[PDB]
Every structure is written in C-alpha cells, then in structure tokens.
Design an enzyme around this catalytic site. Structure first.
Site, short mmCIF file in Angstrom:
data_model
loop_
_atom_site.label_atom_id
_atom_site.label_comp_id
_atom_site.label_asym_id
_atom_site.label_seq_id
_atom_site.Cartn_x
_atom_site.Cartn_y
_atom_site.Cartn_z
N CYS A 32 12.82 6.48 22.25
CA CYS A 32 11.60 6.44 21.44
C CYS A 32 10.33 6.81 22.22
O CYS A 32 9.45 7.49 21.67
CB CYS A 32 11.40 5.07 20.83
SG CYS A 32 12.77 4.70 19.70
N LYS A 58 8.10 3.11 11.73
CA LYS A 58 8.84 4.37 11.76
C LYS A 58 10.31 4.12 11.50
O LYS A 58 10.81 3.05 11.83
CB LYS A 58 8.66 5.06 13.12
CG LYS A 58 9.19 4.25 14.33
CD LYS A 58 8.76 4.91 15.65
CE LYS A 58 9.19 4.12 16.88
NZ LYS A 58 10.66 4.25 17.16
N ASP A 107 7.63 0.12 20.26
CA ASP A 107 8.80 -0.69 19.92
C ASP A 107 8.99 -1.93 20.81
O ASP A 107 10.12 -2.28 21.19
CB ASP A 107 10.06 0.19 19.92
CG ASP A 107 10.06 1.21 18.79
OD1 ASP A 107 9.11 1.17 17.97
OD2 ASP A 107 10.98 2.05 18.75
#
Lengths: 213, 213
Positions: free
Chosen positions: A144, A111, A21
């Site tokens: 995450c 995702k 991310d």
C-alpha cells in the site's frame, strides 16, 4: 550512483502527510494481517504528526476498508479470500490505532484496495488544498505505501518516503526463495530513491517542516 | 504459505499479451538505459508472441517515449535528468528491438512514465475487445512491469506475470546496501504472487493458451 538523489523543498502550505493503513488489523499482534515491524514506526509517526499539525501541514489517514458483502471486492478477494470478513467496515480492527488516533481537523480517506489514489477521495483532498508534495509513512512498505507512492508520482506529486516510518512484512517462499521484511524494505527504499521520489528520515523531514514554517 | 497461489483460466478471446518497453534503449548494450538481463528474455517472449498470434490473442507493445522538449516530463525529469534526450520520439533507441518487431495487427501503446495504464490508450484497447486478463512480460520487472501489474489489478484485471520473461536491473547502493537484479526479481515475483495476481512461466502460459484454443 550515476544520477543524484532527489530532495524536495518543503512548502508547508503545499504539503500533506499521508499515514497509510495504520489500522488495528495490521498493527495489533492479534490482527488478521499483523505486520510486526509496525511496532517500530509508531513513535516516529507520532513525532511527525505533532510537527505537521503545529506547522499546519495537512494530515491524511488512509484506511483499507470494504463493505463486507463482497460487492466491492473482485481481484482483492481472489488474492485475499477472507478479505470481506477481516476488512469489513463493521470489523473493529479496521480502526486506526489509538496511539495515532486521528484528530478533529485530520482527514480520513477510505480505499478498497492498495493504492491510496486509485478511485479514492485523495486526489480531490490534495488538489483542493493545492498540495503538490506528499510525505508517506505507514504499512505495508512495498504494497500500500509503494502503490500510493507510484500512483502519486504518476500524477506529478513530489513524493517523500520516510525510511524509518514505513513497515514491511516477511513473505513465505512461493517459489523464489524466502523473503524477509528487511530485504523487502532494502529493495523498496532503493527503488523509491532511484525511480519514484525522495527517501529521507522522519527526523530530517520534521526539521525541514520546522525550518520552512 | 497460508493462502493459495492464484491461477487465472485463459480465455483467448478475453486475453492480451503486454510486452513492456522492449526498446533498444533498454535492450542494446550501448543503450542509455541498458538492462543486461533483457538478453535472457527475448527468446521466451518470441515463443509467447508466436503462440499468442496463432491463437488470436491480442499482442500489445508498450513503449516509453516522450516528446523531447520537456513539455511532458516533470517528475520523470527530476528522477532521470537526461530523459528528454534519451526517450525522445526522434531518438532511434526508443524503437522496439528487431528480434521482437511488431507485426501489422499488433497494437503499440506509448506512455510518458512507468505505468502502462496511467493516462495511456491501454484501458481503451483492452476494454474495447472485452479483455479482462493480461499476460505481462518485458522490462524493468519492478518498475514499468510491476507498475503496469499494480495498475492492472486495481482496474480489476486478472494479471499473469511471467517469471522467466521479465527482466530486472541492479541498483547502486543509495544508503540501504547493494541491490542485485536477482534480489529485485526474487522480491518482485514473490510480491506479485502474494499481492497482485498470478506468477507462472512462459512455457506454461503458452500451453494454457494452446489448450484453450
């Protein structure tokens, strides 16, 4: 310490780097989900990716991206009410930062939530290449990144978390006291080293990759 | 706080209580994996289970149990070298503590690792009853309890973590400083409230169960 720290031997053919991310929404000061400590991990990640590609170690970027219409957000929208307007595929800030721009042979896995594994392409990408060892960097350390780590070890992956290449964020006091990014980071890395896999530095993992290749 | 705390409305027909790993190995002082803060959560859990059973709210116990021969431990054995000798099915300490002895209508779900969901019967048990809301208590807060919570929210469950009924453990300094159970707990509950679901007290969830029934 009463049990030893874990170290995983690196076989480049069976290793991948996962960049969690590193999107503008988390990395730019104007981003809706800006995590200021990301500034300090861009350089180590750049070094890591340069070494990985040189040793033919697969590089995978995760991006947290939703459709934008609310069809794919339930609990995520309860927890982050604006999610459909900030992580929508059409939103410019869902793109990976230019400092870490994916290259043509790199893999991008999208995702809907925090986990890099749950309901995503990642397990197919890794097992198709016979990868069993993953090196995790990116943001947010305890969210995450850690969910990807927990989900990876539960699938029997040998997981290496980079202490100097995962960025945590401060939390407001929600009833249990103030929580700084430094405290999040301390607790997360300690937990990973005791419960989920290896913690080491970017520099040491690069050396280990170079020596095995 | 810039976004609101989440609260889930309790429908007893669609709710279950999950009691994570309240086994002798974690709860007895002589247990190989003793977590001393478990002493402080037995009473609230007892009250919770009494209210749940009275309202026909399903009670599920998780137990961390392996075969003992090493056939079902890979990463778990790398991280805990003695796992096959302490969490083996034949080991007396894998049993749930007598203070929380499962009753005949309760469900017992066994697991090989930390997650109550990954590769376990739990999702079948919950979805067969049309449950979409789970109340999590037990030990260890940031490890098996939190992995169950993260895995639950990723399956779209509405998760409630009980602040006074999840027990954390101290960690040794592995390079990032000493880490107390209190710090683990503070960081875990804050993270759950910001990222994964609701945090509330046992007493308030009992009231909510009683009022809905």
């Amino acid at each position: 310490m009463s049990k030893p720290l874990v170290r995983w031997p690196i076989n480049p053919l069976r290793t991948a780097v996962i960049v969690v991310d590193m999107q503008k929404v988390f990395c730019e000061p104007t981003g809706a989900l800006y995590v200021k400590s990301t500034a300090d991990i861009v350089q180590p990640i750049q070094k890591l990716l340069q070494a990985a590609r040189a040793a033919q170690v697969m590089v995978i970027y995760l991006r947290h991206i939703v459709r934008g219409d609310g069809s794919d957000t339930g609990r995520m929208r309860d927890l982050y009410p604006n999610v459909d307007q900030i992580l929508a595929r059409h939103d410019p800030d869902v793109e990976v930062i230019e400092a870490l721009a994916p290259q043509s042979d790199d893999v991008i896995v999208d995702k809907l939530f925090y986990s890099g594994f749950h309901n995503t392409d990642l397990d197919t990408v890794l097992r198709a290449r016979d990868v069993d060892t993953i090196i995790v960097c990116g943001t947010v350390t305890n969210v995450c990144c850690e969910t990807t780590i927990r989900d990876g070890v539960h699938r029997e992956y040998k997981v290496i978390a980079l202490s100097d290449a995962n960025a945590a964020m401060d939390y407001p006091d929600v009833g249990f006291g103030a929580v700084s990014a430094a405290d999040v980071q301390r607790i997360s890395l300690t937990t990973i080293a005791y419960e989920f896999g290896e913690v080491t530095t970017t520099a040491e993992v690069i050396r280990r990759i170079e020596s095995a290749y």
